[PDB]
Design a protein around this ligand. Structure first.
Ligand SMILES: C=CNC(=O)N1CCc2c(sc(NC(=O)Cc3ccccc3)c2C(=O)OC=C)C1
Ligand SMILES: [Zn+2]
Ligand SMILES: [Zn+2]
Length: 329
């Protein structure tokens, strides 16, 4: 009834679960490629979600292992490790002082569950690739947020496997509300919705209302869900805000995935997607471009929303951007 030594080392690494920059690749190794399951279980216990939602623990573990198994180990970036990273990052963002006591237990559950499922069964190619290949998925979803609709359908469908229904004790009211928020959050991870999400985030910063305890004031669903959508989108795009040793590992992985799509696009003979061309790419230029145009405007606006809780994260992003720039041949 006592941890093995490997379990002990894993447990000590998980003591950093509340911190930006968790060694998530080490946790994946230590856990035997179960980063999503162990991190989720840890967060659910830490936030007392099992008791609050009457979730039986064997059901939670069974579902988590099932969900984790439906991520593709042969996909370099969009895999269970990425899912675990987004979950843990969302967990840290939810704990930010500016949001203390703002969200209900069910909204917290929605943000974390949405994070866990948000990329499940990702084939490692883009929506546009699936559309252009006449793939079944694209036909199923009428070319519209193809992957994101799929991640949702899979994440929910897996609740129906043996001893997997972690929501079995929620009321119909709780379930309908949970399901709607989860759907709204995952559909918001489609990059084609990025400019719109950011627009609404800026608007909210402009009309920002704090309240009583120095805490953000969100008094309608539209506002509450937009903050959660943006929070998870930030987590999804948090790699360049992490310590450089982590960030670089993620960059390698996504470029591996992109270059592979590029190869398959050359094989087939389609015109090669942006920065997916292995032979004449600039990994460094692309990272600087992606940060200047997407990641920095997003995180800067988030930082404004929760000022100054996110200052250290933004500084790290800026340091990493300078590093990648300095490294341009
Ligand atoms: C015309 C619009 N273009 C886009 O919407 N995309 C093109 C590039 C890109 C993503 S998502 C994503 N990256 C992420 O989603 C998270 C991440 C950021 C930085 C390093 C590793 C991973 C990238 C990217 O990194 O590009 C640079 C190589 C989607
Ligand atoms: Zn995604
Ligand atoms: Zn993702």
């Amino acid at each position: 009834g006592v941890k093995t030594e490997q379990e002990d080392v894993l447990a000590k690494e998980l003591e950093d679960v509340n911190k930006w920059g968790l060694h998530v690749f080490r946790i994946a190794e230590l856990s035997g490629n179960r980063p999503l399951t162990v991190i989720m279980h840890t967060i659910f216990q830490e936030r007392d979600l099992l008791k609050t939602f009457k979730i039986p623990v064997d059901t939670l573990i069974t579902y988590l292992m099932t969900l984790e198994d439906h991520y593709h180990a042969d996909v370099a970036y969009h895999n269970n490790i990425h899912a675990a990273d987004v979950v843990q990052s969302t967990h840290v963002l939810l704990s930010t002082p500016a949001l203390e006591a703002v969200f209900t237990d069910l909204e917290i559950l929605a943000a974390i569950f949405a994070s866990a499922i948000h990329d499940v069964d990702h084939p490692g190619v883009s929506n546009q690739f699936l559309i252009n290949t006449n793939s079944e998925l694209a036909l199923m979803y009428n070319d519209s947020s193809v992957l994101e609709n799929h991640h949702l359908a899979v994440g929910f469908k897996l609740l129906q496997e043996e001893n997997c229904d972690i929501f079995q004790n929620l009321t119909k009211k709780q379930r309908q509300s949970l399901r709607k928020m989860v759907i709204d959050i995952v559909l918001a991870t489609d990059m084609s919705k990025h400019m719109n999400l950011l627009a609404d985030l800026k608007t909210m910063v402009e009309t920002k209302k704090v309240t009583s305890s120095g805490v953000l004031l969100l008094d309608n669903y539209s506002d509450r869900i937009q903050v959660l959508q943006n929070m998870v989108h930030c987590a999804d795009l948090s790699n360049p805000t992490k310590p450089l040793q982590l960030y670089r590992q993620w960059t390698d992985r996504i470029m591996e995935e992109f270059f592979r799509q590029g190869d398959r696009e050359r094989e087939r003979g389609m015109e090669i997607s942006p920065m997916c061309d292995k032979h004449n790419a600039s990994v460094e230029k692309s990272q600087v471009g992606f940060i200047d145009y997407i990641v920095h405007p997003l995180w800067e606006t988030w930082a404004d929303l929760v000022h100054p809780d996110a200052q250290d994260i933004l500084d790290t992003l800026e340091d990493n951007r300078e590093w990648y720039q300095s490294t341009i041949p």
